């Protein structure tokens, strides 16, 4: 939750400020900060949005092109942090340690994503300290509705810049 590093995401729909929990998720925070400082998240979008659930981004450009991320990181979902409204967590595939650059912001309590005995879960590494209204807005933009990409916005919100604050 309330950690130390602060990151500002300036999007085409508004600004979102994050507070990263360096003590509870050291690996996740360092990985995220490295992407931020390298300008990796600049011009990436929230390519997957689900009303009442979450908004996911950090992997595709405005042209819907997948960017080349750095090596995956270990999953820190066992750090006790829960996927409650306002938290930011790492997206990943089947393998628990496959998270790279994609992250999502929970706009509601998504306890089914928390670490459990049957699935390792998704690692929470921070929370939104400002701009939750913006996150909510992003989750409600119109999306496609046919194939496996029906959660992709017609016009994905773009992250114009991401910056670590002083």
From Swiss-Prot:
Residues in PPIase cyclophilin-type domain copies: 3-164
Top EC class for this record: isomerase
Localization in the cell: Periplasm
GO cellular component, one term: periplasmic space
This protein's UniProt keywords: Isomerase, Periplasm, Rotamase, Signal
First-listed, main subcellular location of the protein, grouped into a coarse class: periplasm
One GO MF term: peptidyl-prolyl cis-trans isomerase activity
Domain of life: Bacteria
Reactions mediated catalytically: [protein]-peptidylproline (omega=180) = [protein]-peptidylproline (omega=0)
Pfam families for this protein: Pro_isomerase
Any single GO BP term: protein folding
Record bears the keyword Signal: yes
EC number(s) stated in the UniProt entry for this protein: 5.2.1.8
Family membership noted in the UniProt record: Belongs to the cyclophilin-type PPIase family.
Function per UniProt: PPIases accelerate the folding of proteins. It catalyzes the cis-trans isomerization of proline imidic peptide bonds in oligopeptides.
Entry protein name: Peptidyl-prolyl cis-trans isomerase A
């Amino acid at each position: 939750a309330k950690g130390d590093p602060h990151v500002l995401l300036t999007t085409s729909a508004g600004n979102i400020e994050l507070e990263l929990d360096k003590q509870k998720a050291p690996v996740s925070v360092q990985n995220f900060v490295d992407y931020v400082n390298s300008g990796f998240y600049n011009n990436t979008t929230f390519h997957r949005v689900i009303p009442g659930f979450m908004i996911q981004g950090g992997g595709f450009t405005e042209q819907m092109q997948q960017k080349k991320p750095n090596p995956p990181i270990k999953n820190e979902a066992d750090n006790g942090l829960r996927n409650t409204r306002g938290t930011i967590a790492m997206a990943r595939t089947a393998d628990k340690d496959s998270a790279t650059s994609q992250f999502f912001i929970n706009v509601a309590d998504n306890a089914f994503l928390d670490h459990g005995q049957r699935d390792f879960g998704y690692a929470v590494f921070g929370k939104v300290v400002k701009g939750m209204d913006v996150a909510d807005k992003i989750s409600q933009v119109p999306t496609h509705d046919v194939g496996p990409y029906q959660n992709v916005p017609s016009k994905p919100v773009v992250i114009l810049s991401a910056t670590v604050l002083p």
